UniProtKB/Swiss-Prot annotation:
Changing D103G: Found in a patient with a neurodevelopmental syndrome; uncertain significance. It comes from Homo sapiens. It is linked to Cornelia de Lange syndrome 6: A form of Cornelia de Lange syndrome, a clinically heterogeneous developmental disorder associated with malformations affecting multiple systems. It is characterized by facial dysmorphisms, abnormal hands and feet, growth delay, cognitive retardation, hirsutism, gastroesophageal dysfunction and cardiac, ophthalmologic and genitourinary anomalies. CDLS6 inheritance is autosomal dominant. The gene is BRD4. There is a cross-link at K57 (Glycyl lysine isopeptide (Lys-Gly) (interchain with G-Cter in SUMO2)). Belongs to the BET family. This is Bromodomain-containing protein 4.
Amino acid sequence: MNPPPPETSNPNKPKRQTNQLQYLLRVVLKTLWKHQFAWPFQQPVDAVKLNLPDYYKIIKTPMDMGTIKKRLENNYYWNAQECIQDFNTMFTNCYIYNKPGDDIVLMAEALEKLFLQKINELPTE
Ligand SMILES: O=c1[nH]c(-c2cccc(NS(=O)(=O)c3cccs3)c2)cs1
């Protein structure tokens, strides 16, 4: 069973645009998206499709790059750090749901290193 995907809009929450958030969409996300290991992370885990009936029994704060992309596109975030926390939740979720050395974990580890490389330096505001 799949819960609804994480919100990508919320009228109670204030919106913002910053140079750093623009960069997170235009450079960081859009480059990671093209990586050969990006595909498992491009949309919410579909537990019915993937036959992972325990996925949402284990993972209570799901996150994926599709959701992050839509959040950036909709100016959902207040700042870069908020967006960065979503990437970090995505990676951590993968390590939590799986086991060290798993192929899916190797993919997340590779993406995380590339992500860290790209956010090491952000534009100034
Ligand atoms: O913890 C997470 N698993 C996934 C995911 C996405 C697509 C397919 C799978 N299962 S899978 O096809 O057996 C697989 C194993 C290694 C990479 S994908 C997991 C995303 S986040």
